[PDB]
Copies of this chain bind each other. A is one copy, B any other.
Amino acid sequence: EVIVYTSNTCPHSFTVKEFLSENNVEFTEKNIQTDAAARKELMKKGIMAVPVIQIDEEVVVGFDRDKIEELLG
């Protein structure tokens, strides 16, 4: 149920990708430098930041590890 909006330009997208993988967390990666639909929806709700973590309804802006570990439990 985890959706991660990433981009190859900056490292916090990889920082959060490693964290999720190292805790056996499944997620759908939507890279906005090749995905136009993900880039479009991210622009729809006006989020000017990367990476975006959508945990089932809630959004985490940036690799806030303390918030991610809470939302996932």
Bound-state CA distance A35–B53 (Å) is 19
How many chain copies? 4
Bound-state CA distance A42–B64 (Å) is 15
**Given known A-B contacts A19-B46, A46-B69, A64 and B33 have beta carbons under 8 A apart:** yes
Bound-state CA distance A26–B16 (Å) is 28
Bound-state CA distance A34–B43 (Å) is 25
Bound-state CA distance A20–B1 (Å) is 12
Given contacts A10-B51, A22-B43, A34-B63, 20 further A-B contacts (CB under 8 A): A2-B54, A4-B54, A5-B31, A5-B54, A6-B30, A7-B10, A8-B12, A8-B15, A8-B34, A8-B62, A9-B63, A10-B12, A10-B13, A12-B32, A14-B43, A18-B43, A22-B40, A22-B44, A33-B66, A46-B69
